[PDB]
């Protein structure tokens, strides 16, 4: 049994509900941009889930992603985002999984949230550029490319990306 | 021991003595009509009648061949006449007894409810209104679990009476009911605490104010897909009046409810977050700056 299923059953058992969660996490998360300034406890906090527990679940989703089982990874990452939507790598891995599944519209949203949670990182913007390109084209690709560019240049950490953007622009 | 005892062993609504008594009252030359008449006479509940008939058919030895044939026909007529009232109820017999043991209600009362609930389309609200007249709120949780257990059983059997797709929708609605119940449970505990607090500082609260009213306001606010601080504040003022400590108290109660009530109550993360913001904004507007 996966640790995720262990947690859900653990939570469900200690409630007066058969299933104390939304049925459709996809619909539940649509258009959602986590606001760090809203003084609300996360469901990780509410359900007393340790960060170590979420990490175990993250690896499970990550493992599924590496096995090209994107459907399974998407399921897992949505749960993680449900429990703690302020962890940027949860959204990023969710975005990547949707990207590989060619669910670009939702992949774009996840990338966008990752950007908000992780302002210094150019890569969420770059993958947004790729996806916007894949819609042929919303014309949001160039705007996202520039945002990646600003964050990519001047820093040695993001040089590989800086080279690519230069290579793109010609 | 004997077959009658085996039927009755785990069944709290009938005894082996009563089953044998029915058996002994039926002669070898009894017609299907005679059999059925004796069954209704000695057994009141159709589900137990159906159970007794199963026993009579099974226990009847080779020497009484004619009787066995009559019993099989009689059981078939019974099943045809009562239908789901007999078979559907019988299939949740033991579940109804185990759950009724935790309530001040009869097992047959629960089976009647289950039949009514699953006998037609029902939304979350309709389920709530249904339970509200019949049960206390604390009992509703156990009752809701009984309903879920019964419907889960109905999914396995795939019976002819209620379609699979309907049970699925029914379970979804019942899950929504259980989410709604968490609010009533939350406010039933906390509202008297708020009232005692307000009374302790000499603040009078409206007599028409109770945890049910507060819970309905909470759900009214949650079901508002475009929440504003103004609308939230107005709803609270309509609820408890214009005293600043009273209004603040309810607002804090609503805000606390966002982490104490079921996540299923919210159809989107965005609105839950936005509602938290608006309650926070309402608190600021209300207090003296
Ligand atoms: Na018994």
Residue numbers in the entry:
A (entry chain D): 1 to 170
B (entry chain A): 94 to 382
Sentences from the paper on this structure:
The type three secretion (T3S) apparatus is a conserved molecular machine that forms a protein-conducting channel from the bacterial cytosol to the target cell cytosol. Our understanding of how the T3SS switches from translocator to effector secretion is limited, but in multiple systems this process is known to involve a conserved gatekeeper protein. Translocator-specific chaperones (class II chaperones) bind directly to translocators, prevent their degradation, and maintain the translocators in a secretion competent state. Protein delivery occurs in a highly regulated manner in which proteins involved in early steps in infection, or necessary to build the secretion conduit, are typically secreted before other substrates, a phenomenon termed secretion hierarchy. This study presents the structure of a molecular complex that physically links one class of early substrates, components of the secretion pore termed translocators, to a gatekeeper protein, a protein that has been implicated in the secretion hierarchy.
The amino terminal 84 residues of CopN were not included in the construct used for crystallization because they are unstructured. Two nearly identical Scc3-CopNΔ84 complexes (RMS deviation 0.34 Å for all CopNΔ84 mainchain atoms and 0.49 Å for all Scc3 mainchain atoms) are present in the asymmetric unit. CopNΔ84 forms a long cylindrical structure composed of three helical domains. CopNΔ84 is structurally similar to other gatekeeper proteins, both MxiC from Shigella and the YopN-TyeA complex from Yersinia. The structure reveals that Scc3 does not engage CopNΔ84 using this conserved binding groove. Instead, the amino terminus, referred to here as a gatekeeper-binding region (GBR), forms a relatively flat surface, adjacent to the convex side of the TPR and binds across the interdomain interface of the last two domains of CopNΔ84. The interface formed by this interaction results from burial of 980 Å2 of surface area. Residues 16–23 of Scc3 interact principally with site 1 of CopNΔ84, whereas residues 24–43 form a much larger interface in which Scc3 projects a ring of hydrophobic sidechains toward CopNΔ84 to surround a highly conserved arginine (R365) on CopNΔ84. This interaction includes three tyrosines, one of which, Y43 is oriented to allow a π-cation interaction. The Scc3-CopNΔ84 binding mode leaves the translocator-binding site on Scc3 unperturbed and available to bind translocators.
